[PDB]
Amino acid sequence: RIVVWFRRDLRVEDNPALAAAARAGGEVVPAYVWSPEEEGPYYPGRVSRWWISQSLNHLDASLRRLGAGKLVTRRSADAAVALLQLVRDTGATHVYFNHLYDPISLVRDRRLKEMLAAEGIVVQSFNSDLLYEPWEVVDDEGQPFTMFDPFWNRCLSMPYDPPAPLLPPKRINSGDLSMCPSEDLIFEDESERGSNALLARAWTPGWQNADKALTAFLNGPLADYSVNRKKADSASTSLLSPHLHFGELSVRKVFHLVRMKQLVWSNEGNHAAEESCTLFLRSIGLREYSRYLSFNHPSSHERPLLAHLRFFPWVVDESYFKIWRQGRTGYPLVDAGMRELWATGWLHDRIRVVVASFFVKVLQLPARWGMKYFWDTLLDADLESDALGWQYITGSLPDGRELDRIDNPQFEGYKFDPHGEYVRRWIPELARLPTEWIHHPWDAPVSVLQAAGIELGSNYPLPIVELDAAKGRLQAALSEMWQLEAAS
Amino acid sequence: RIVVWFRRDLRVEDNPALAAAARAGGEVVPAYVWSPEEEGPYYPGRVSRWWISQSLNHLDASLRRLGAGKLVTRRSADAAVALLQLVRDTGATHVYFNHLYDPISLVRDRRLKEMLAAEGIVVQSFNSDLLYEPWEVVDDEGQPFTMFDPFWNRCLSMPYDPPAPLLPPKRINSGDLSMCPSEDLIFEDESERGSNALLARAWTPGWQNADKALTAFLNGPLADYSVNRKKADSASTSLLSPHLHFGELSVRKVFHLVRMKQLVWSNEGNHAAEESCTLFLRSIGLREYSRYLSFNHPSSHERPLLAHLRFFPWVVDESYFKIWRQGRTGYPLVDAGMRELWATGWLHDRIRVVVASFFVKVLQLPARWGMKYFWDTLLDADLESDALGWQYITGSLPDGRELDRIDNPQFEGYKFDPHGEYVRRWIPELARLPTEWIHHPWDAPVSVLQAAGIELGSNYPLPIVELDAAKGRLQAALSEMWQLEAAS
Numbered sequence: 001r002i003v004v005w006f007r008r009d010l011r012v013e014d015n016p017a018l019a020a021a022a023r024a025g026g027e028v029v030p031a032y033v034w035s036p037e038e039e040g041p042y043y044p045g046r047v048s049r050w051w052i053s054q055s056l057n058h059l060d061a062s063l064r065r066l067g068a069g070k071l072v073t074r075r076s077a078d079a080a081v082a083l084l085q086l087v088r089d090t091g092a093t094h095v096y097f098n099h100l101y102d103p104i105s106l107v108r109d110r111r112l113k114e115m116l117a118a119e120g121i122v123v124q125s126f127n128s129d130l131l132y133e134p135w136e137v138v139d140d141e142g143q144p145f146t147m148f149d150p151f152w153n154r155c156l157s158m159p160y161d162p163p164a165p166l167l168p169p170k171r172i173n174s175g176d177l178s179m180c181p182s183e184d185l186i187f188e189d190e191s192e193r194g195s196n197a198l199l200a201r202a203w204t205p206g207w208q209n210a211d212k213a214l215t216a217f218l219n220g221p222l223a224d225y226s227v228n229r230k231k232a233d234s235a236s237t238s239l240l241s242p243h244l245h246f247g248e249l250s251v252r253k254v255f256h257l258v259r260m261k262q263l264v265w266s267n268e269g270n271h272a273a274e275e276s277c278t279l280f281l282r283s284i285g286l287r288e289y290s291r292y293l294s295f296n297h298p299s300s301h302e303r304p305l306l307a308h309l310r311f312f313p314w315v316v317d318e319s320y321f322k323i324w325r326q327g328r329t330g331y332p333l334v335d336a337g338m339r340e341l342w343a344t345g346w347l348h349d350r351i352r353v354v355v356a357s358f359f360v361k362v363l364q365l366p367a368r369w370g371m372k373y374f375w376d377t378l379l380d381a382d383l384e385s386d387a388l389g390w391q392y393i394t395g396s397l398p399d400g401r402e403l404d405r406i407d408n409p410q411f412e413g414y415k416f417d418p419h420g421e422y423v424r425r426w427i428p429e430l431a432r433l434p435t436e437w438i439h440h441p442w443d444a445p446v447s448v449l450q451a452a453g454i455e456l457g458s459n460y461p462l463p464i465v466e467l468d469a470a471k472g473r474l475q476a477a478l479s480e481m482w483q484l485e486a487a488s
Numbered sequence: 489r490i491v492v493w494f495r496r497d498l499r500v501e502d503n504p505a506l507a508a509a510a511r512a513g514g515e516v517v518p519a520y521v522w523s524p525e526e527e528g529p530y531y532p533g534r535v536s537r538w539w540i541s542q543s544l545n546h547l548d549a550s551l552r553r554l555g556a557g558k559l560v561t562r563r564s565a566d567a568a569v570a571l572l573q574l575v576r577d578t579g580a581t582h583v584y585f586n587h588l589y590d591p592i593s594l595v596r597d598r599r600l601k602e603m604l605a606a607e608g609i610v611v612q613s614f615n616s617d618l619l620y621e622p623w624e625v626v627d628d629e630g631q632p633f634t635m636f637d638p639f640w641n642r643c644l645s646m647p648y649d650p651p652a653p654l655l656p657p658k659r660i661n662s663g664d665l666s667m668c669p670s671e672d673l674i675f676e677d678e679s680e681r682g683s684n685a686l687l688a689r690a691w692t693p694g695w696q697n698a699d700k701a702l703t704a705f706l707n708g709p710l711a712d713y714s715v716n717r718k719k720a721d722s723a724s725t726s727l728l729s730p731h732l733h734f735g736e737l738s739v740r741k742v743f744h745l746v747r748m749k750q751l752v753w754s755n756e757g758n759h760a761a762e763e764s765c766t767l768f769l770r771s772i773g774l775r776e777y778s779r780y781l782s783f784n785h786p787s788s789h790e791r792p793l794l795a796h797l798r799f800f801p802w803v804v805d806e807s808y809f810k811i812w813r814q815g816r817t818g819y820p821l822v823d824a825g826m827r828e829l830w831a832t833g834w835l836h837d838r839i840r841v842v843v844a845s846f847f848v849k850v851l852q853l854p855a856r857w858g859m860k861y862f863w864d865t866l867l868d869a870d871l872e873s874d875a876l877g878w879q880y881i882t883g884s885l886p887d888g889r890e891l892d893r894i895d896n897p898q899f900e901g902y903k904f905d906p907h908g909e910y911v912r913r914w915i916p917e918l919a920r921l922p923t924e925w926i927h928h929p930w931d932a933p934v935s936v937l938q939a940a941g942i943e944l945g946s947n948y949p950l951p952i953v954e955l956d957a958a959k960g961r962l963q964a965a966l967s968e969m970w971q972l973e974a975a976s
């Protein structure tokens with residue numbers, strides 16, 4: 001009677017589509033269709049595909065234990081085609097899904113509403129990803145916000161709270177789907193299966209593991225988040241991002257659970273933990289703002305993503321891109337993160353800032369290139385969140401980070417790795433190199449680098465581009481961009 | 489502006505009156521009116537009066553951290569006269585509270601609404617005690633239930649889940665309270681304050697401690713509630729009893745958290761633990777049924793509580809009552825539990841029936857007598873739930889226990905205390921008595937009693953009333969009454 005279409009909500013708690021299909025009375029057919037060709041350039045990358053293959057298997061058993069035959073797995077190049085074969089094949093009255101906010105889904109999914117409503121299907125879409133809908137939060141003239149601070153300040157002062165997380169169905173009734181077939185989905189090249197499976201050393205995809213990681217963070221490093229959130233040398237953050245990208249966890253549960261921890265800590269005098277919750281919710285609000293930006297000010301053609309860097313003369317150099325991917329740049333904080341991104345599919349947010357800032361400030365390679373690599377290597381590769389991050393580090397946002405400027409690697413090192421233990425964990429070659437030079441080995445005297453057993457150029461690479469050359473080329477590239485910009 | 493009248497909702501999370509008042513955007517003056525005169529024969533007990541005063545200081549402290557000036561306290565024989573007087577002193581506009589369901593408050597609250605409306609006061613009441621309101625769960629012809637099982641299975645198949653718990657106010661503001669005065673309430677007589685304080689050996693009243701107790705049960709004995717809920721030789725139940733009576737913990741939060749614990753365990757193959765939450769929610773539902781029976785079938789005069797034994801020949805013997813009070817009855821399980829009741833103001837459910845079944849079926853004293861003792865010595869002294877519990881053991885309603893019948897103590901012991909460790913702990917005199925006789929020492933050979941250093945009559949009392957002489961008396965008292973029954 002009702003189809004529940006899964007997309008990026010691979011959970012069973014607080015899933016309004018599935019919870020309303022079950023409470024309608026009739027049967028519920030839960031299904032997922034793999035239509036990546038519809039995603040154009042944003043076709044899910046290598047390691048994100050490896051997550052879905054485990055997340056779906058994991059969500060299958062969850063569904064089956066609640067009284068389902070299966071999760072129907074359909075394959076297509078058009079989602080409507082596969083979806084309305086299923087409404088026919090499995091003969092339903094309704095199609096329920098929770099609506100997304102990326103520019104691809106926003107118009108593909110309104111082509112589905114009409115396509116399906118022309119063959120008599122009733123369609124309803126629900127909120128599964130945001131505390132507040134993007135249209136629900138505006139300024140005093142009713143307009144979208146343009147910076148993050150006024151926007152998040154509004155959500156924190158909204159006249160109602162984010163809806164409480166719904167319970168899962170008591171059980172779901174699917175009927176006999178012994179008839180209905182499921183297409184064996186292919187997510188992994190045979191050639192890559194053996195290295196993709198090593199991602200499980202660090203991660204376990206699934207609604208169940210997302211829930212255990214949240215109560216692990218809530219009862220652990222959340223109390224110190226106020227003071228440690230920027231450090232990459234301890235597990236200072238929640239490690240929930242891939243779980244949240246695929247919707248395996250409610251953000252409305254996280255909001256509600258964290259607000260309860262705050263009330264208790266406030267009654268215990270734990271003032272530093274109370275601010276920890278304030279700051280961690282802000283990080284949850286940055287995910288809200290990523291959707292708010294892609295909905296209210298989408299990529300257009302009149303003005304694209306990185307539109308302020310149109311006439312920026314990028315260095316085109318595949319050699320440099322190869323050194324960056326391999327973490328052989330010779331900048332230890334960058335190399336350390338590029339090694340961990342390849343090995344685990346994840347990076348602390350500030351190491352993301354470092355590796356991406358280095359990409360467009362020192363090597364000054366097309367940001368597209370690095371945006372694509374991120375898409376193939378991140379387990380939490382998220383359309384709106386990746387766009388917001390690259391927009392932030394390149395200075396397309398007014399909120400964003402300054403354009404005409406390069407970070408001193410010691411500034412990065414002292415903030416995200418003060419004792420150098422992040423570099424030493426991922427680059428053991430430099431273990432015996434003192435903290436004083438571990439983030440800029442090129443500046444150390446030969447005696448100090450010989451004591452550390454480091455030969456810059458054989459044991460560990462030389463700086464592929466020197467800072468002073470990078471800054472000189474950055475001013476020459478921006479002046480080139482600014483004389484060009486006025487010429488229009 | 490708004491005045492939040494606290495009664496039996498001593499908590500900040502999922503307090504709809506408080507949440508609604510805070511969300512109005514005005515000012516929120518919290519207050520407690522002490523009017524025990526309005527409860528007549530249900531004047532709050534001795535140890536319940538101690539818990540309240542502990543809980544109020546706890547709640548006042550947490551209110552002030554939220555920004556309130558204080559918790560306003562008023563002493564008057566009539567609630568309304570005090571509630572009116574308060575909003576006169578404050579210039580308030582509204583009076584919010586959460587409605588109760590005992591036959592006293594249902595009528596006193598209702599008159600307050602009309603009385604306060606007349607004087608120009610906006611008044612609204614909210615549900616905070618129950619999963620569903622009683623007038624929502626009816627049979628298929630729309631009439632109230634009369635047995636527990638059909639009621640609870642309708643609550644469990646109800647078309648909508650019980651409302652998820654509300655968030656506490658992020659802040660409350662009340663303005664200037666320096667003229668708004670509060671008169672210190674007196675809950676304890678000076679000569680009993682010391683003896684009362686020792687209740688803190690076993691209980692710390694307060695919503696925070698209710699929260700911590702719930703977290704402790706969920707991560708602890710809840711998994712083993714299916715096989716151990718009857719045992720009293722260990723901490724097998726939640727011990728959330730007095731917290732839930734004073735509304736220190738939202739039952740709706742308990743429901744949602746347990747239901748979600750059920751889902752994770754089911755998915756983990758932990759069937760026993762899954763089964764355990766089923767029974768634990770049933771115990772929550774018994775508290776729902778407690779308000780159902782008092783809302784639908786209240787008792788005053790034509791069928792007052794225990795009307796069926798109107799015609800019972802009660803043994804009016806104040807000597808036997810005192811021996812029951814002091815746990816000197818010679819029945820260990822009875823004496824053990826009677827000590828703990830006086831010691832810690834709490835008793836396990838099954839021990840609540842052992843000392844109660846014994847009070848009316850062995851000593852056969854007025855059930856109204858042992859009712860007033862429970863009222864004075866139970867911290868979780870609850871009008872509706874005490875009503876249900878007595879009706880259960882006396883057989884006053886079809887769900888109840890069989891009347892002409894007396895539990896063999898070894899039956900009780902084997903279900904509630906397999907190794908006799910419960911009474912060894914509360915009656916260390918019997919510590920050396922082997923388990924076989926520990927629940928019936930009078931049937932032991934003198935050689936065994938002396939080997940344990942027991943001498944019935946001097947070391948540990950002789951059974952004040954024998955069982956044979958009591959079921960005999962039971963027949964002679966029941967047919968004398970059925971003879972009186974069919975004679976009118």
Ligand SMILES: Cc1cc2nc3c(=O)[nH]c(=O)nc-3n(C[C@H](O)[C@H](O)[C@H](O)COP(=O)(O)OP(=O)(O)OC[C@H]3O[C@@H](n4cnc5c(N)ncnc54)[C@H](O)[C@@H]3O)c2cc1C
Pocket residue numbers: 237238239240241242244245283284286287288290347348349350352353356378380381382383385386388389390392393
């Ligand atoms: C260049 C760049 C690329 C990024 N790409 C991604 C991406 O593909 N996917 C992604 O989820 N995040 C991305 N981010 C944001 C941020 O780096 C990650 O959210 C964070 O590192 C995930 O780790 P965590 O779960 O421990 O975060 P926590 O600190 O534990 O935060 C909790 C949750 O808040 C959300 N969140 C936190 N920071 C941000 C942020 N800046 N923007 C949006 N949501 C946020 C995430 O859902 C995260 O799981 C990117 C940032 C930059 C600068």
Ligand SMILES: Cc1cc2nc3c(=O)[nH]c(=O)nc-3n(C[C@H](O)[C@H](O)[C@H](O)COP(=O)(O)OP(=O)(O)OC[C@H]3O[C@@H](n4cnc5c(N)ncnc54)[C@H](O)[C@@H]3O)c2cc1C
Pocket residue numbers: 717725726727728729730732733771772773774775778835836837838840841844866868869870871873874876877878880881
């Ligand atoms: C004679 C008699 C008198 C009672 N008097 C009271 C009383 O004054 N106050 C009171 O709250 N309960 C009363 N009960 C019910 C029961 O004994 C207690 O609720 C329970 O033993 C308290 O332990 P717990 O909180 O660990 O229960 P749990 O096993 O943890 O149960 C969870 C909660 O469900 C509720 N509950 C469980 N069983 C019952 C029940 N049979 N009836 C009503 N609610 C129930 C309680 O709120 C309890 O805290 C009485 C029972 C009897 C037989």
